[PDB]
Amino acid sequence: KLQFALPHETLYSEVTQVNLPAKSGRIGVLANHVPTVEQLLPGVVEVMEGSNSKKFFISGGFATVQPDSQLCVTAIEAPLESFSENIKNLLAEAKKNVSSSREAAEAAIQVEVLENLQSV
Amino acid sequence: ATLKEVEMRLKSIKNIEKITKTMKIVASTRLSKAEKAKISAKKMDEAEQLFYKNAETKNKELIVAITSDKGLCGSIHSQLAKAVRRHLNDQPNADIVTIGDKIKMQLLRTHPNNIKLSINGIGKDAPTFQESALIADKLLSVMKAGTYPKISIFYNDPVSSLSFEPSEKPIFNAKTIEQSPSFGKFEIDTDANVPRDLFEYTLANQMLTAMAQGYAAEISARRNAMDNASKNAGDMINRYSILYNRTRQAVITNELVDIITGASS
Amino acid sequence: YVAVGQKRSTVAQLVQTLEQHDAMKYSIIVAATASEAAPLQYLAPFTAASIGEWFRDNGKHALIVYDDLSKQAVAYRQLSLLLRRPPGREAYPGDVFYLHSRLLERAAKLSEKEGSGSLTALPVIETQGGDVSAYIPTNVISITDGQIFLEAELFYKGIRPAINVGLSVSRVGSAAQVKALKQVAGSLKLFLAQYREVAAFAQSDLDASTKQTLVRGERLTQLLKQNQYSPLATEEQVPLIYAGVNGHLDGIELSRIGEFESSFLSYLKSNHNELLTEIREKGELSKELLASLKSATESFVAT
Amino acid sequence: YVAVGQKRSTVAQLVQTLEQHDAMKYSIIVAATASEAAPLQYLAPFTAASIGEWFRDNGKHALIVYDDLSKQAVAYRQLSLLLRRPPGREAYPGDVFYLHSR
Amino acid sequence: LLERAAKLSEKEGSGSLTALPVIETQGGDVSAYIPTNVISITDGQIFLEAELFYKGIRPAINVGLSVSRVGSAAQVKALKQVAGSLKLFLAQYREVAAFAQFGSDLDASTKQTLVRGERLTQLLKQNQYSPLATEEQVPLIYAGVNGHLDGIELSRIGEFESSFLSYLKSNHNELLTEIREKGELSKELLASLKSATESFVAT
Amino acid sequence: SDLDASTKQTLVRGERLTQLLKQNQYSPLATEEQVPLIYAGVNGHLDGIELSRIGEFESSFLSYLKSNHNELLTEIREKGELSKELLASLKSATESFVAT
Amino acid sequence: AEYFRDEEGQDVLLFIDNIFRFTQAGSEVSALLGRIPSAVGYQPTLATDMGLLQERITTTKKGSVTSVQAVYVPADDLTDPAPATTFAHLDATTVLSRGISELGIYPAVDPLDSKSRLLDAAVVGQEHYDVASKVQETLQTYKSLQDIIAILGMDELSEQDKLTVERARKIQRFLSQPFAVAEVFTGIPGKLVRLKDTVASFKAVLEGKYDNIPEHAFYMVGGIEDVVAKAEKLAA
Amino acid sequence: AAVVGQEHYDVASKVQETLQTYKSLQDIIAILGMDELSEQDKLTVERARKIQRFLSQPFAVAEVFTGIPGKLVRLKDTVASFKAVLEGKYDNIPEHAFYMVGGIEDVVAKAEKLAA
Amino acid sequence: ISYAAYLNVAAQAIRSTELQTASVLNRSQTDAFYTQYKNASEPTPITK
């Protein structure tokens, strides 16, 4: 199952498939999964309960499978459909300004969110 | 004289009563939102705590505290100060990072080896992850937080919608995670530095929880205080009312004496 | 109508208002105007009562409105002081109680051997500071069999009649209540009682119960407003109150309560003038009438 | 024990209480009940104090409890008003201080 | 008695007796018959408040209960200009001060008032048996009203007043002569005074 | 309100003393008997009896005093002025009863 | 005035000043006449004397006389019998308040405390009545909100409340208009504003048609035309 | 101050102002906790509570009635003592140490007594 | 810089259709000032 949480509403608690972008590449979790801690990166995320799929745009967070076969995900903010065109355009402009000006880390993340959105 | 001094003070007391009534009611409205945030946040936190337990994390010492800049939110300022004081016998020279102006004054007094970093302007605002994140970033750099093998956080756990019990919890440093043994039933290679990442993330995630717990307790205290105020004001209203009534009767006796003097004529 | 100390201009308006509403043809105005002398003022309620005796003795009914006993008091004060009688409490003659009591006991509902005569009376006292503490109010309050205490805040808040029903009581009360109206308004007393208490915690919205009370209460308070110099027939009082009791008005917008009222009444008049006539003659509400009424209220509420 | 302005019944209960505690044999009771005339009540404390002085002037130690002088004040008030002397302060006689002090 | 004091016409030789009644108030009861009567007769009230005497204004004049119906037409033309909003400031201070003792989180506007107001009361403070020349009251009110003293710390306001006057006596004694001589403040004089005051903010 | 330890101690004594003050109507007490009782409270030995049981202590203490040594009370009956011996005897006696 | 009303037949506009002095004078000669004084020393014949004066002044069919009688409310307590007795006799009460004067508003008339029974809806017409009801509510709300703004804070007020407050401050100072005889007591020339113009101008304000005009451009000026003009002046 | 000197007058001035403040906040103290008063005010309140207690002085004639051996203190000593207290010099020792006792030196000694 | 600062920036960047709830905007808006302290002694508070 999936336990997904945000500090404004806990989105999930049994979810069938979860697709996660992790610092181990991309991970798919189904029911029992061996217990890990994985950092969730800034992401395009899918959570599927059955074949029905919900697509999430994520500010990264943490994933930690607890040894009871539950994927505890905590993240700052999630939707993808809400996030997805003019905002991508704005992000391009903002990316240009950000390129010159921690300023590096900001620009890397700014490019990453813009790219991840561009993927949508 | 009696009459006017009674009345003017009674009017003051009335005006105070009215303001505190208004505040108490508005506080109740506000309290619902404060508490609401705290539920969702606390649920999010518990998922992480599930890790810390199973990891058997088993944590100088840092003290962090949470209060508001704002006042008239009961005895939060001094009750949290008191629960700090008990644990400030556990290291007097401990550096307290104070989120909120009010507790700061009291702690600063209790030891001046305390306030090193402080954060002003959280008190007005609601619990928000961004704030927690910036505070975390500054905590790591300024206080060298990871260096301290202990961190302890203070807040007011909002026990019931009419109570607050001051509470603390331990934030687990990157060193702690490393040497906790049942961290090994969870997995990472070396591809990420999960102690160095998880510490930072739970520095904020735990901090946000502490803030949420505190914020609800603050608004709860304000409600409680303003209610008790209405009672105290009522008592003074009644005492001065009896005095007013007696003073009124006496004047009529003087007037009747004047009329009786006219009768003597 | 016993106009005591009232300026001739005010009473002229009164007379004119009575003529306008074609009420002169059963009205009597015993007048001791502002100018009229304090001896005339002293005997003015006494004189008025005497007129009342003729009707009462004839077994018929009548209503004498002593307005206001407060000015009667002042005249007695003036009279007494000039007669060199010591002035009583609050400088109002010692036997002012005796005077007021004599007047107010000369109103009565006679025995059946006396042909069940009626002289209803409604004394009016004006509280100059709103203080019922004051000696002349206290005395009269004791003598009277009920009081209605109107409050200034309500008046200011545009509630006319500005009756504060918390401080209004009737000591004869429901004995003289229409059966129909009794049925549909026990609830109303209780609803308003809650509304009053939960008005002071609405400064806010917390419990679902408190907000429900508030919706029912606010709409009711608005409903009980009435534009002065428009009277209301009981056969049209009961439907409106029924609606409120059944909380059908809750949905109706506060501003539209007024619009609803007149429309509802006309709707009732067109659709069910059978109901109105039934209400009038039965004087009580049959289960069938309350049934029919509910249907009608729902239908009107939908529009 | 000077009982002034008190119900004759209440005084009788007091007497019975005292006689139950067998204290009567060493004590005198002067009584000036409420029913008794207001001037008589006025003269009641003064008279009692005379009796006390006879004991005092035997050189023998004694005690006198004047319960309640507040009722003497009301009594003197009545007397004063009925003597049509202008009311003193708080409408209690102007010589009320003198009454008590003497 | 009181109406025998009046300003007479120039065909009456322009005489003028001015009167100042003094009325003791028994517990501050102004509804007492003698106090009520006098209030009507007179053209002003100069209420003195005991609490403010203790608070340190000595003499203390409760300005709320003090009125002068006749008002400016005897107030120096200059002094009228400067003290124009002195009344408004004080009135605002009074409202704000009531709130202020409940000491809740202050509106920025209110704490501007509060800070300014506190200084103003302290500025007013009188010292028994020591009058002050009007020519040297004009600077102090200019400084205060033009908020130059709003910043200056409350404790050392008393020091400031003395020193400011001394400073003007030393340096701008020409200006003082002009205020005395011309009794209305010209644009140049207002600016000169402003420059002087500004300089004395930091001393 | 924050109660300083000095005030708190006084409050604790004061409250305990208030219990000691109480009398039961139509029961008069010997002067001699009052002397030990006041000694106890002044010397703060009624810390040693929780407030609820202060009344029990008082009666028991009086019974104790008579049984233990009515000699002290007989002395106060005649002398009417405390001596060092009486003072010590009271310290000793009060501590002894307070303990039990 | 009677001669004018009656025998010259014309309308009048009587003015009496100050009628508390009429009470005081009468109280004095009552005591001189030896009559036992009534409450707060006021003459036992107070009512009938007031009554005689007041009744004599009236609109007859011979003429019409419009009294304006000043009353001094001693120590601002009108629960004192002398103002209260007069209170009955007078048709259209007006309350002037020290506070409102102190706020710098001249007229010093406190609008919510003034009461005129000529504000009957039909008499002044429905439009006038409704507009004035809206004004009264708006100000009363503002007064209620003054407590919240002061202590609790300005910012916690709703958007709706804030607009009502902003308009109320404008309305409050739109009341402020100069007086021609206070070119002496001020200097700003007074403005006589038509009845129709006033009704219109207050309506506009409530709708917020002139919420693009500074608050101080309502302060101490006449009509809407002036308010608009003063917006330009402040703009400059 | 032309009589008893400016320094004497100044010392008295501060006492009066402080006490007047203390009287002023009596309402507020009851309705809302004294803790919930302003930091500046709490110092004033603490000072004033001390001043009030300080004003005490056992009488010599009624040394019996008070049951405390009488205290008579020099005027010159008094001005000095209050001056110090106003400067908060001895503000650091029990409020009850100022209660029903004389001069500043006695307060210090009573602190030692209390400390035991 | 810190990992959680990276995650923070990502949340902020996501707060840069287009349109989003008040709580997001509030979570990405701060009026605080980190007040450097020491001992009492405080280097001047600058916005956080």
Question: For G36, which DSSP code?
Answer: P
The rounded distance, in Å, linking the Cα atoms of B212 and B206 is: 10
Residues of chain G with C-beta less than 8 angstroms from the C-beta of E47: none
Domains, chain I, with CATH or none: 1-48 (1.10.1620.20)
- Strands C30-33, C2-6: pairing kind: parallel
Say what angle helices G81-89 and G19-33 make with each other, to 10 degrees: 120
**Angle at C290 (CA atoms; ends C285, C296), nearest 5 degrees:** 130
Please identify which residue in the block is written with the tokens 């508490």.
Answer: B35
The residue length of chain G stands at 236
| Closest approach of H42 to chain B, Cα-based (Å) | 13
Q: In terms of CATH, what superfamily is C1-177?
A: P-loop containing nucleotide triphosphate hydrolases (3.40.50.300)
Please identify which residue in the block is written with the tokens 């991309």.
Answer: A26
Which chains contact A through at least 3 pairs of Cβ atoms less than 8 Å apart?
Answer: B, I
Phi, psi of A63, deg, nearest 5 = -125, 140
The rounded distance, in Å, linking the Cα atoms of I34 and C229 is: 67
Closest CA to F15 of F47, F43, F39: F47
- Three-state SS string over B105-174 comes to HHHHHHCCCCCCEEEECCCCCCCCHHHHHHHHHHHHHHHCHHHCCEEEEEEEEEEECCEEEEEEEECCCH
Phi, psi of B205, deg, nearest 5 = -65, -45
* Stretch (H or E) spanning G16: strand G15-16
Sign of CA dihedral C102, C104, C107, C112: negative
What is the residue-wise DSSP string for D17-66?
A: HHHHTT-GGG---EEE-SSS-HHHHHHHHHHHHHHHHHHHTTT------E
Phi, psi of F58, deg, nearest 5 = -65, -50
CATH number of H1-116: 1.10.1140.10
Residues of chain F with C-beta less than 8 angstroms from the C-beta of H33: 1
Q: Where are the alpha helices (DSSP H) in chain H?
A: 6-24, 26-31, 39-54, 63-66, 75-86, 104-115
| Closest approach of B30 to chain C, Cα-based (Å) | 9
Query: What ranges make up the beta strands (E) of chain A?
Result: 2-5, 17-22, 25-30, 37-49, 52-66, 70-75
Q: How many CB atoms lie within 10 A of CB B193?
A: 15
For residue G159, the one-letter residue type is E
The rounded distance, in Å, linking the Cα atoms of A67 and A32 is: 9
Strand order from edge to edge, sheet including C30-33: C30-33, C2-6, C66-67
| Closest approach of C137 to chain G, Cα-based (Å) | 15
Say what angle helices B3-54 and B194-264 make with each other, to 10 degrees: 160
Q: How many CB atoms lie within 10 A of CB C107?
A: 20
The rounded distance, in Å, linking the Cα atoms of G138 and F98 is: 74
Q: What separation in angstroms does the CA of E3 have from each of E17, E18, E30, E46, G26? A: 10, 10, 21, 18, 20
Contact C82, G34 (CB under 8 A): no
How many beta-carbon pairs under 8 angstroms link B with E?
Answer: 16
3-state DSSP assignment of residue E178? helix
Question: For E157, which DSSP code?
Answer: H
Q: In terms of CATH, what superfamily is B1-25+226-265?
A: ATP synthase, gamma subunit, helix hairpin domain (1.10.287.80)
| Closest approach of B20 to chain G, Cα-based (Å) | 10
Structure tokens at E182: 């011309």
Q: Compare CB distances from E28 to B1, B16, B70 and report the shortest one's residue.
A: B1
What is the residue-wise DSSP string for chain B?
A: --HHHHHHHHHHHHHHHHHHHHHHHHHHHHHHHHHHHHHHHHHHHHHHHHHHHHTT----EEEEEE--S---STTHHHHHHHHHHHTTSS-TTPEEEEESHHHHHHHHHH-TTS-SEEEESSSSSPP-HHHHHHHHHHHHHHH-GGGSSEEEEEEEEEEETTEEEEEEEEPPPHHHHHH-GGGTTS---SSS-HHHHHHHHHHHHHHHHHHHHHHHHHHHHHHHHHHHHHHHHHHHHHHHHHHHHHHHHHHHHHHHHHHHHHHH-
Q: How many CB atoms lie within 10 A of CB E91?
A: 19
Domain of E179: which CATH number? 1.20.150.20
The rounded distance, in Å, linking the Cα atoms of A105 and I48 is: 18
The reply to whether E156 belongs to the active site is: no
| Closest approach of B197 to chain A, Cα-based (Å) | 8
Question: For I23, which DSSP code?
Answer: H
For residue B221, the one-letter residue type is A
Closest CA to B37 of A82, A6, A72: A6
- Quick one: C287 exposed, middle or buried, by C-beta within 10 A (0-12, 13-18, 19+)? exposed
Check CB contact under 8 Å for G151 and E104. Answer: yes
Catalogue the long-range contacts made by G194-199 (C-beta closer than 8 Å, 24 or more residues apart).
G197/G223, G197/G224, G198/G223, G199/G127, G199/G128, G199/G131
Contact B103, B80 (CB under 8 A): yes
Phi, psi of A62, deg, nearest 5 = -140, 150
3-state DSSP assignment of residue F40? helix
Structure tokens at H54: 């300080």
Catalogue the long-range contacts made by A52-57 (C-beta closer than 8 Å, 24 or more residues apart).
A54/A79, A55/A79, A55/A80, A55/A81, A55/A120, A56/A80, A57/A82, A57/A83, A57/A84, A57/A116, A57/A117, A57/A120, A57/I14
Q: Does F83 reach chain H within 8 Å, measured CB to CB?
A: no
Please identify which residue in the block is written with the tokens 């009711």.
Answer: C220
Check CB contact under 8 Å for H36 and B225. Answer: yes
Contact G100, G106 (CB under 8 A): no
Please identify which residue in the block is written with the tokens 């000015």.
Answer: C71
Contact F73, F65 (CB under 8 A): yes
Which chains contact E through at least 3 pairs of Cβ atoms less than 8 Å apart?
Answer: B, G, H
The rounded distance, in Å, linking the Cα atoms of C170 and C183 is: 18
The catalytically annotated residue of E58, E69, E94, E116 is E69
Cross-strand partners of C66: C2
Residues of chain C with C-beta less than 8 angstroms from the C-beta of G140: 156
Contact H107, H98 (CB under 8 A): yes
B/e letters for G167-204, b = 16+ CB within 10 Å, e = fewer, are bbebbbbbbbbbbeeeeeeeebeeeeeeeeebbebbbe
Q: Give Cβ neighbours of residue H93 (< 8 Å, ≥ 6 apart).
A: H107, H108, H111
**Angle at E101 (CA atoms; ends E100, E105), nearest 5 degrees:** 50
Q: How many CB atoms lie within 10 A of CB F86?
A: 19
The rounded distance, in Å, linking the Cα atoms of G58 and C224 is: 37
The rounded distance, in Å, linking the Cα atoms of A110 and I9 is: 8
Q: What separation in angstroms does the CA of A111 have from each of A88, A105, A108, A117, I6? A: 11, 10, 5, 10, 12
Residue C237 φ/ψ region, left for φ over 0, alpha for ψ in the -120 to 50 degree band, beta for the rest: alpha
Q: Which domain holds residue E98?
A: 76-203
CATH class of this structure's domain C178-303 = mainly alpha
Q: What separation in angstroms does the CA of E140 have from each of B197, E161, F45, G133? A: 64, 7, 67, 48
The rounded distance, in Å, linking the Cα atoms of E1 and E3 is: 6
Contact G113, G78 (CB under 8 A): no
Cross-strand partners of A46: A19, A55
| Closest approach of A41 to chain I, Cα-based (Å) | 8
- Quick one: I29 exposed, middle or buried, by C-beta within 10 A (0-12, 13-18, 19+)? middle
Residues of chain H with C-beta less than 8 angstroms from the C-beta of F4: 94
3-state DSSP assignment of residue C230? coil
The rounded distance, in Å, linking the Cα atoms of A76 and C204 is: 32
Structure tokens at C87: 């002035």
- Quick one: G81 exposed, middle or buried, by C-beta within 10 A (0-12, 13-18, 19+)? buried
Structure tokens at G205: 């304000």
Check CB contact under 8 Å for G140 and C156. Answer: yes
- Quick one: C262 exposed, middle or buried, by C-beta within 10 A (0-12, 13-18, 19+)? exposed
Cross-strand partners of A38: A63
Q: Compare CB distances from E55 to H17, H25, H38 and report the shortest one's residue.
A: H17
Say what angle helices G46-56 and G81-89 make with each other, to 10 degrees: 30
The rounded distance, in Å, linking the Cα atoms of G163 and C261 is: 32
Closest CA to G75 of E163, F72, E36, B234: E36
The rounded distance, in Å, linking the Cα atoms of B72 and B227 is: 12
The rounded distance, in Å, linking the Cα atoms of G146 and G150 is: 6
Question: For C92, which DSSP code?
Answer: S
Q: Compare CB distances from G147 to B19, B263, B265 and report the shortest one's residue.
A: B19
Q: Where are the alpha helices (DSSP H) in chain G?
A: 2-5, 19-33, 46-56, 81-89, 98-102, 121-124, 126-147, 159-175, 195-207, 224-235
Closest CA to C216 of C239, C198, C238: C198
The rounded distance, in Å, linking the Cα atoms of G156 and C223 is: 32
The rounded distance, in Å, linking the Cα atoms of G147 and B112 is: 40
Domain ranges of chain A: 1-84, 87-119
Residues of chain B with C-beta less than 8 angstroms from the C-beta of G34: 265
Domain ranges of chain F: 1-100
State how far Cα C192 lies from the chain centre. Answer: 17
Structure tokens at E49: 């408040």
Structure tokens at C136: 């002349």
Q: What separation in angstroms does the CA of F78 have from each of F30, F72, F74, F93? A: 13, 10, 6, 19
Structure tokens at G27: 């109280």
Fold of B26-225: Pyruvate Kinase; Chain: A, domain 1 (3.40.1380)
Contact B146, B173 (CB under 8 A): yes
The catalytically annotated residue of C89, C171, C196, C219 is C171
Which chain E residues have any C-beta within 8 angstroms of a chain G C-beta?
Answer: 30-31, 33, 36-37, 39-40, 71, 87-88, 91, 95, 99, 102, 104-105, 107, 109-110
Contact G206, G138 (CB under 8 A): yes
Cis peptide preceding D93, ω within 30 of 0: no
- Strands D66-67, D2-4: pairing kind: parallel
For residue H99, the one-letter residue type is Y
Catalogue the long-range contacts made by G85-94 (C-beta closer than 8 Å, 24 or more residues apart).
G85/G23, G85/G46, G85/G47, G85/G50, G86/G19, G86/G23, G86/G50, G88/C5, G89/C7, G89/C34, G89/G50, G89/G51, G89/G54, G90/G54, G91/C9, G91/G116, G91/G117, G91/G118, G92/G116, G92/G117, G92/G118
Structure tokens at E153: 């710390």
Widest CA span in chain C: 71
Say what angle helices C273-282 and C234-245 make with each other, to 10 degrees: 110
**Closest E-chain CA to B16:** E102
Q: How many CB atoms lie within 10 A of CB G160?
A: 9
- Three-state SS string over G91-153 comes to CCCCCECHHHHHCCCCCCECCCCCCCCCCCHHHHCHHHHHHHHHHHHHHHHHHHHHHHHHHHC
Contact B229, H31 (CB under 8 A): yes
The residue length of chain A stands at 120
Sign of CA dihedral B184, B188, B189, B193: negative
Domain ranges of chain H: 1-116
- Strands B95-99, B61-66: pairing kind: parallel
- Strands E44-45, E67-68: pairing kind: antiparallel
Check CB contact under 8 Å for B264 and D86. Answer: yes
Closest CA to A71 of A82, A59, A61, A81: A61
Check CB contact under 8 Å for G47 and C78. Answer: yes
Widest CA span in chain D: 47
**Angle at G47 (CA atoms; ends G44, G48), nearest 5 degrees:** 100
Q: Give Cβ neighbours of residue D24 (< 8 Å, ≥ 6 apart).
A: D15, D18
CATH number of A1-84: 2.60.15.10
Q: How many CB atoms lie within 10 A of CB C253?
A: 10
Contact B78, B57 (CB under 8 A): no
Q: Which of E55, E105, E111 to mutate to test the interface with H (most CBs of H within 10 A)?
A: E55
The rounded distance, in Å, linking the Cα atoms of E31 and E44 is: 17
**Closest C-chain CA to G87:** C128
Closest CA to E89 of E126, E123, E51, E137: E123
CATH number of G119-236: 1.10.1140.10
Say what angle helices C69-82 and C135-143 make with each other, to 10 degrees: 120
CATH number of F1-100: 1.20.150.20
Cross-strand partners of A52: A49
Q: What separation in angstroms does the CA of C280 have from each of A71, C293, C297, E26, G94? A: 73, 14, 18, 68, 47
* Stretch (H or E) spanning C147: strand C146-150
Closest CA to A81 of A117, A40, A111, A115: A117
7-66 in chain G: CB under 8 A from chain B: 34, 36-37, 39
Cross-strand partners of B167: B155
The rounded distance, in Å, linking the Cα atoms of E141 and E149 is: 10
Please identify which residue in the block is written with the tokens 């008040």.
Answer: I22
* Stretch (H or E) spanning C104: helix C96-104
Check CB contact under 8 Å for E102 and B19. Answer: yes
Check CB contact under 8 Å for I31 and B121. Answer: yes
Closest CA to C184 of C236, C231, C244: C244
Check CB contact under 8 Å for A39 and B197. Answer: yes
